[PDB]
Design a protein around this nucleic acid. Structure first.
Ligand SMILES: [Mg+2]
Ligand SMILES: [Mg+2]
Ligand SMILES: [Mg+2]
Ligand SMILES: [Mg+2]
Ligand SMILES: [Mg+2]
Ligand SMILES: [Zn+2]
Lengths: 329, 121, 53
RNA sequence: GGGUCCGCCUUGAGUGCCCGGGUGAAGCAUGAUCCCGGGUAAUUAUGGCGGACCCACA
RNA sequence: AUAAUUUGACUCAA
């Protein structure tokens, strides 16, 4: 009943004396509303009807944005958690697209099966499953393995089975339900589906329907009230909550935003259990997202060593002028 | 009660509203369902708008009270959408109904309109 | 739609009354939205009164 | 030479689906059916081209 | 441009 996004890491302190200057940078709280939007992500409750792609098009049009992208395609009839990264935050979806997801599904059986048998057989689907993407898909139709982290049956009303399921990204629930029906012998189809979790995003007070999103927008635009629309948009830092982090010194920030790789002497703090090749989020000591990168060292190697490239910086999100140039020749 | 319910309707008055829908269904003209009802209001054709109190999500009918007030059209609440649907002569629920021609419910709709007016203030 | 959610504890259920806390459940799926939003003015008038704006 | 940042490496027409307008009848008025109109996302990697910054062990 | 990813897309013509 837990996904990889729920597993927490210990913080390893490399430099205890490292502190941050309050005059530099823009932490989420200090961002003016216009800047907040530029580096924002919406935890959208998608309605049934439109495709996820159309919904993003609608958001772009209504909020007058040049750029937006979602964290994984929900089907037209499917509702629920759709992370929509905005403007300068658009590329953060690369941390969201391959992330674990949770669904609540309604399965309709084509025959009568005892409740204990349903529970028993559905338990057998936890673990690795082999799927081929359906004729209607956005990816290559080849056999591939996907992980089902957990299945929890909530309730059964005759042929209708309501269940929660945690899956690896790109797991087709309609196909999963089809094979459960085959394992039960009678056959089954998916009648209803809702996404309840997408990476770090879930059903909390930040989850917002299109109705509330646009209404809060006009409360700002036309009423002059910023508070509601501010809470409608999450800082891009939220889209990075599930990733291992390296916290860097002020004097290393501008260098990274200007294209430098992250060397060992720039690290103040870091999460434990980082392996070579892992995707890490480079953060300031104010918890601003600076960049995404690939670890060239393990957590222990970053902590013990005094020299060398710790993180290969790949995607810079922070503007160059938030922190002053503090590097030397 | 949901936040789109602006005033408390006594049992007797709610039953008269359903009675008026049944009579206007048989002897006059009605529109049933929220889209039909909304169009009737905006076109200025509705004599009375009937709104169910158990509509979920609220957004289906939430626009109707402010719309009716703008168009100067009286509205009334009934406790049950299934019951309102039944009164409208359909097999399913109706979130809202508009009476266009009261027919033999002429005097009943007039009474309802009088009683909602004092509830509004 | 058959999937319902309790407003109190967040339980997903098919029942009208939550099997965990007993609260009256609501449909889990959001209502239809349109970018044309022809009645947005009237929905916002309701919403402002609810929120206290 | 390298890295980061931005842009580009087709455009139409149609199907599907949806949304609006009109119509307003198992499932279904929280919208059947048909007509008209419109809408339909990004990311990653590699390469090429145009541009902006920087070359940084903190 | 080419190859991929994401639970939803497909066909044709320059
Ligand atoms: Mg239509
Ligand atoms: Mg035709
Ligand atoms: Mg058409
Ligand atoms: Mg170049
Ligand atoms: Mg120039
Ligand atoms: Zn509950």
């Amino acid at each position: 009943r837990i996904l990889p996004a729920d597993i927490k890491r210990e913080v390893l302190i490399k430099d205890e004396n490292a502190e941050t200057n309050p005059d530099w940078g823009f932490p989420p709280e200090k961002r003016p509303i216009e800047m907040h939007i530029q580096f924002g992500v919406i935890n959208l409750d998608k309605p049934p009807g439109p495709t996820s792609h159309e919904v993003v098009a609608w958001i772009k049009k209504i909020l007058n944005l040049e750029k937006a992208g979602h964290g994984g395609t929900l089907d037209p009839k499917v509702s629920g958690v759709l992370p929509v990264a905005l403007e300068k935050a658009t590329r953060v979806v690369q941390a969201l697209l391959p992330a674990g997801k949770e669904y609540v599904a309604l399965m309709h059986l084509h025959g009568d099966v005892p409740e204990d048998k349903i529970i028993q057989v559905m338990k057998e689907f936890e673990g690795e499953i082999i799927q081929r993407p359906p004729l209607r898909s956005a990816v290559k139709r080849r056999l591939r393995t996907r992980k089902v982290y957990y299945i929890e049956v909530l309730e059964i009303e005759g042929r209708d089975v309501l269940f929660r399921v945690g899956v690896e990204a790109g797991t087709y629930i309609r196909s999963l339900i089809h094979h459960i029906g085959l394992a039960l012998g009678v056959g089954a189809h998916m009648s209803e589906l809702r996404r309840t979790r997408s990476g770090p995003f879930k059903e909390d007070e930040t989850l917002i329907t299109l109705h509330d999103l646009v209404d809060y927008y006009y409360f700002w635009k036309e009423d002059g009230i910023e508070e509601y629309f501010r809470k409608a948009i999450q800082p891009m830092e939220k889209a990075v909550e599930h990733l291992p982090k390296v916290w860097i010194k002020d004097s290393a920030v501008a260098a990274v935003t200007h294209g430098a790789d992250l060397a060992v002497p720039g690290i103040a703090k870091l999460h434990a259990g980082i392996k070579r090749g892992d995707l890490v989020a480079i953060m300031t000591l104010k918890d601003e997202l600076v960049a995404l990168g690939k670890a060239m060292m393990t957590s222990q190697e970053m902590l013990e060593k005094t020299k060398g490239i710790a993180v290969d910086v790949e995607k810079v999100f922070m503007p160059r002028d938030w922190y002053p140039k503090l590097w030397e020749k | 009660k949901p936040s789109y319910v602006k005033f408390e309707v006594p049992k007797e008055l709610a039953e008269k509203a359903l009675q008026a829908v049944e009579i206007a269904r048989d002897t006059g003209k009605i529109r049933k369902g929220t889209n039909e009802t909304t169009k009737a209001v905006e076109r200025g054709q509705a004599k009375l708008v009937i709104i169910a109190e158990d509509v979920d999500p609220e957004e289906i009918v939430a626009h109707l009270p402010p719309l009716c007030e703008e168009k100067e059209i009286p509205y009334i609440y009934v406790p049950s959408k299934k019951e309102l649907g039944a009164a409208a002569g359909i097999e399913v629920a109706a979130a809202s109904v508009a009476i266009i021609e009261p027919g033999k419910a002429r005097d009943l709709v007039e009474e309802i309109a009088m009683k909602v007016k004092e509830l509004m203030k | 739609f058959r999937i319902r959610k309790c407003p109190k504890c967040g339980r997903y259920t098919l029942k009208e009354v939550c099997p965990v806390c007993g609260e009256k459940t609501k449909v889990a799926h959001p209502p239809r939205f349109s970018p044309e939003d022809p009645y947005g003015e009237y929905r916002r008038r309701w919403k402002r009164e609810v929120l206290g704006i």
